[PDB]
Amino acid sequence: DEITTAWPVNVGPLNPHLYTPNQMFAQSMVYEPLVKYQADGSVIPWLAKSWTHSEDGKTWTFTLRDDVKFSNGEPFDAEAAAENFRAVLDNRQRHAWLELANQIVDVKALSKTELQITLKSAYYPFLQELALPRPFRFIAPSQFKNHETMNGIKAPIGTGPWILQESKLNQYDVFVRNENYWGEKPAIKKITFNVIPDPTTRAVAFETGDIDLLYGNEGLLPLDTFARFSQNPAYHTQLSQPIETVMLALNTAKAPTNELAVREALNYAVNKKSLIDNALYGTQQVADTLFAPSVPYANLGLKPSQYDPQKAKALLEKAGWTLPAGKDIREKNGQPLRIELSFIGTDALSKSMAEIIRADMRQIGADVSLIGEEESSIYARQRDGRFGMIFHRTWGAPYDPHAFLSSMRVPSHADFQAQQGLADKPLIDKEIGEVLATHDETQRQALYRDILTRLHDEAVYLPISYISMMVVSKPELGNIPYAPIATEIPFEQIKPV
Ligand code: NI
């Protein structure tokens, strides 16, 4: 029958080619890619039924499916696809994070069913990136604004299994099944998203039976509630295997995290196991490295820095950071060891984790100053480089590691900003561009090794934990599957009671 859920914000215009305020989960319900990501890291035919490969690795020819219509009824053509790529590529610099956007030289519709794509070089992540939620998915060209999407679209018309119903009230986004869908019909016919800003209200609405499912891991319900729910059979909860890392990004261009010895010492200071148990209700795993070893090209045997306050103090001592009799905070040339940790003040877990971080770090003679602020000002901080330490997370499959590394080269973003003090930073960036264009496996693995190892050994990050996808479900829904892409929600696989 029908399902109701909630989300902190509306779904946005649903422009397939743009970013915030469009919500990616909603983008992926309405729009579809050429090729679909699978959990084993492979891609299957999707809107593209088959594709050829030149010896070059530079020109690609996709045979498209011939039986697909936009929810309009307008046909999904090679022309329609070519026209989407064009609209995408006219806003090129905005997609610079995603190397594929820079890679595409031309897109040509050869025939109604044949789509030719040429790259400037043999870009190995090609298919995986075509499969992402955005920007390479397809709105009916009829809905462009002035032969463009850059500056807005008309109606959000995709080929996918769900249709966004015309908005009457900002408090609801309603999706209805596409009964003209080319592919398999969802058993569920309607999904209603309540826009509920407050975490506690979303938990109450689930408690009073107004919500069938909450699928998400960005604070969709409070974690203490999640933990209580997991102990109560009135509810069903799940955690997937971990999918992304949560860390601190240390600013290598700002004193005193500009000093390698300080970053190394901070990587020994946090009792991560205790933090997870006490702030996170035991729901995540301890992270020693930027990427979990199960991430592609990331099983590198890097050396963990365990919780070891003694080793940290020694590093600090050796670097000239000494304790004044008997003050607790180290000074170097009379200057105290003071470090700012910025985080979102309305995020109760950022705040709890910050406090524990401050306390662990005080034990090693670092005075960390807590700066909690509204979300949008933390995001400006990330872009501006205005932080000592800031929380940050990776992006999951299939972004990790190649797209997360690719975006590090991009000037106005947290990882780019955090690495600015590194002598290494131009070389790391060079090697990022090189790995992406690689087709030899030995070359590929060794370049990924070098980039990740430099980042680890230069102690750019303070990995904290690996977080999973999280589900809270009315029990009658039974076990919920996980979409292979972290930010998608598998609505189409859900079976009604
Ligand atoms: Ni993003």
Q: Which parts of 374-457 are beta strand (E)? A: 389-393
Cα(344)–Cα(346) distance, integer angstroms: 6
* Residue 400, both tokens: 């990790």
Cα(22)–Cα(24) distance, integer angstroms: 6
Residue 39: phi and psi, rounded to 5, are: -55, -35
For residue 421, the CA-to-ligand 1 centroid distance in Å is 24
Q: Is 46 left (phi over 0), alpha (psi -120 to 50) or beta?
A: alpha
135 cis-preceded (ω within 30 degrees of 0): yes
For residue 454, the CA-to-ligand 1 centroid distance in Å is 24
Measured CA to CA in angstroms, residue 51 lies from 23, 130, 177, 232, 306 at distances of 30, 13, 29, 50, 48
* Residue 249, both tokens: 């990004």
* Residue 216, both tokens: 């998400």
Q: Which of 162, 164, 212 is nearest to 185 (CA)?
A: 162
User: Is the separation of the CB atoms in 145 and 153 below 8 Å?
Assistant: yes
Cα(190)–Cα(133) distance, integer angstroms: 21
Q: Which of 431, 382, 427, 440 is nearest to 405 (CA)?
A: 431
Instruction: Sketch out the chain's domains with CATH numbers.
Output: 1-240+469-497 (3.40.190.10), 241-468 (3.10.105.10)
10 Å Cβ neighbour count for 493? 14
For residue 345, the CA-to-ligand 1 centroid distance in Å is 21
For residue 320, the CA-to-ligand 1 centroid distance in Å is 40
For residue 224, the CA-to-ligand 1 centroid distance in Å is 27
Q: Which of 490, 455, 387, 3 is nearest to 212 (CA)?
A: 3
For residue 411, the CA-to-ligand 1 centroid distance in Å is 15
Pairing of strands 335-336, 331-332: antiparallel
* Element at 7 (helix H, strand E): strand 2-7
Cα(280)–Cα(390) distance, integer angstroms: 18
For residue 1, the CA-to-ligand 1 centroid distance in Å is 33
| Residues 6+ away with beta carbon under 8 Å from 3 | 188, 190, 191, 192, 212, 213, 491, 494, 496
Residue 370: phi and psi, rounded to 5, are: -85, 120
For residue 208, the CA-to-ligand 1 centroid distance in Å is 33
**Elucidation method:** X-ray
What is the secondary structure of 109-143 as a DSSP string? EEETTEEEEEESS--TTHHHHHTSSSSS----GGG
Q: Specify the residue for token string 């963990």.
A: 304
Residue 427: phi and psi, rounded to 5, are: -70, -45
Measured CA to CA in angstroms, residue 370 lies from 154, 268, 272, 355, 464 at distances of 44, 20, 18, 8, 17
For residue 137, the CA-to-ligand 1 centroid distance in Å is 16
For residue 24, the CA-to-ligand 1 centroid distance in Å is 9
User: Is the separation of the CB atoms in 80 and 62 below 8 Å?
Assistant: no
Q: Report the DSSP beta bridge partners of residue 81.
A: none
What's CA 74's distance to the chain center, in Å?
33
User: Is the separation of the CB atoms in 485 and 244 below 8 Å?
Assistant: no
Cα(481)–Cα(466) distance, integer angstroms: 20
Q: Which of 289, 322, 249, 345 is nearest to 355 (CA)?
A: 345
For residue 178, the CA-to-ligand 1 centroid distance in Å is 27
Which of helix, strand or coil describes residue 12? coil
User: Is the separation of the CB atoms in 326 and 272 below 8 Å?
Assistant: no
Residues with their C more than 2.5 Å from the N of the next written residue in the chain, i.e. before a break, are none
304 cis-preceded (ω within 30 degrees of 0): no
Helix axes of 441-457 and 425-436: crossing angle, nearest 10 degrees? 150
Cα(201)–Cα(162) distance, integer angstroms: 27
User: Is the separation of the CB atoms in 217 and 246 below 8 Å?
Assistant: no
For residue 290, the CA-to-ligand 1 centroid distance in Å is 18
* CA-only gyration radius of the chain, Å: 24
For residue 259, the CA-to-ligand 1 centroid distance in Å is 30
Cα(419)–Cα(404) distance, integer angstroms: 14
* Residue 317, both tokens: 């001592």
User: Is the separation of the CB atoms in 433 and 123 below 8 Å?
Assistant: no
Amino acid, res. 435:
V
For residue 352, the CA-to-ligand 1 centroid distance in Å is 25
Cα(354)–Cα(348) distance, integer angstroms: 10
For residue 414, the CA-to-ligand 1 centroid distance in Å is 12
Q: Is 127 exposed, middle or buried (0-12, 13-18, 19+ CB in 10 A)?
A: buried
b/e code 390-422 from CB counts within 10 Å (16+ = b): bbbbbbbbbbbbbbbbbbbbeeebbbbbbbebb
For residue 431, the CA-to-ligand 1 centroid distance in Å is 23
